[PDB]
């Protein structure tokens, strides 16, 4: 399960890297803002402080969302159940 | 399962087409912006760079969301599990 | 199952009514905008074209979200599986 | 199950407290606005009336979202099924 976590973890980083590079290049964001934006998009928060301005950015965002949501939310699920939950349970007992 | 994917795929395209046509017509968006907006609405991202301005657009958006979320997120589920997951698994093995 | 649908349906309408009344009264929105806003909040779209300006509105929105999301998304689930899915299946066959 | 509810309830309050303190301190929000913002972020509504302006706030928000969504939505699930549902069922019968 550490290896089920590791795979989704890696694939999430790669996905966020892809968005950082595209939005920094095509939409002209600073790298930190492109990552932030990629995260705010794929978790569906969508503040809108940043949003794509070019048609190439709009089209990319459509595809990035559909390809990216299932991965991101899979990782969050694995994180919650296989990492966060056990550590919570361990805290309720003194060794 | 390719035919379970195909049905949801088609129904998603039809749903996004419906929104593209309405928002381009009633809210005056360019077709590309209406599609983008329809996608950003039904995936619940909701940047708000675009939002309906007319009461007819507001009422439509209410119904489009309720009718459209269950479909869109069904497709994303099918996509993740029946397409993305297997291809990931295939990459971890050399033929 | 029509009666499992009917209950969630009614409870959803009541929930959206509650929000329409509060936001129209305390935040000064037109009734149509308060409903629209209530729907955009509880489905987690959150365009932000409307957002509460008063501390009383902010506090209410916190509680409305936590109480309201589980209901709204339950209805959408019931809608998709017990209404939308069967009708889709019926269309694929001529009577 | 009251103790399964109580744990997630407490962990949710602690999580929202953490965000209130950070955003009030680093991003300069009033405490009430920082709580409101933390809630609007972790439920994925994301109005964007508030959004982090500093790089330290942006980085924190990335991590807060990934750590916080699984908890928040777990609580909402427990709330809906173990608290809201039973009380609904009890109302349909006179004692
Ligand atoms: K969701
Ligand atoms: K959102
Ligand atoms: K927004
Ligand atoms: K906005
Ligand atoms: K949003
Ligand atoms: K959302």
Convert chain C into a string of H (helix), E (strand) and C (coil): CHHHHHHHHHHHHHHHHHHHHHHHHHCCCCHHHHHHHHHHHHCCCCCCCCCCCCHHHHHHHHHHHHHHHHHHHHHHHHHHHHHHHHHHHHHCCCC
**DSSP H or E stretch at residue B95:** none
Mutate to test the interface with B, among C5, C9, C13, C47 (most CBs of B within 10 A): C47
Residue matched to tokens 């070019």: A54
Q: Which of A45, A49, A75 sits opposite D44 (nearest CB)?
A: A45
Secondary-structure percent of chain A, ordered helix, strand, coil, rounded to 5: 80, 0, 20
Instruction: For residue B54, give the DSSP letter.
Output: S
Q: Which of A32, A48, A79 sits opposite D70 (nearest CB)?
A: A79
Determine the Cα–Cα distance for residues B19 and A57; give it in Å rounded to an integer. 20
C18-51 b/e (C-beta count within 10 Å ≥ 16 → b): ebbebbbeebebeeebbbbbbbbbbbbbbbbbbb
Please choose, from the candidates A50, D47, B64, the residue with its C-alpha nearest in 3D space to the C-alpha of residue C27. Answer: D47
Domains, in order of start, for chain C: 2-92 (1.10.287.70)
Instruction: For residue B17, give the DSSP letter.
Output: H
> Taking the CA of residue A40 as centre, how many other CA atoms within 13 Å lie in the half-sphere pointing to its CB?
30
- Experimental technique used? X-ray
Cβ–Cβ under 8 Å, residues B42 and B72: yes
Residue A91 token pair: 């805290």
Question: In chain C, what residues touch B7 (CB-CB under 8 Å)?
Answer: 88
Cβ–Cβ under 8 Å, residues A4 and A82: yes
Query: In Å, what resolution does this model reach?
Result: 2.0
Residues in chain D: 95
Determine the Cα–Cα distance for residues B54 and B26; give it in Å rounded to an integer. 8
Cα B66 vs. chain centroid, distance in angstroms?
Answer: 12
- Min Cα distance B40 → chain A (Å) is 8
- Min Cα distance C5 → chain A (Å) is 27
Interface residue A46 vs chain C (CB under 8 A): yes
CA distances from C32 to B48, C21, C40 (A): 18, 10, 12
Residue C19 token pair: 């929000």
D32-41 b/e (C-beta count within 10 Å ≥ 16 → b): ebbbbbbbbb
């Amino acid at each position: 399960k550490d290896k089920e976590f590791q795979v989704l973890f890696v694939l999430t980083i790669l996905t966020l890297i892809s968005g950082t590079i595209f939005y920094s290049t095509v939409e002209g964001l600073r790298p930190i803002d492109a990552l932030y934006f990629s995260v705010v998009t794929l978790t569906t928060v969508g503040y809108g402080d940043f949003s794509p301005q070019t048609d190439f950015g709009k089209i990319f965002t459509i595809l990035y969302i559909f390809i990216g949501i299932g991965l991101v939310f899979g990782f969050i699920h694995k994180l919650a159940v296989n990492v966060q939950l056990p550590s919570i349970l361990s805290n309720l007992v003194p060794r």
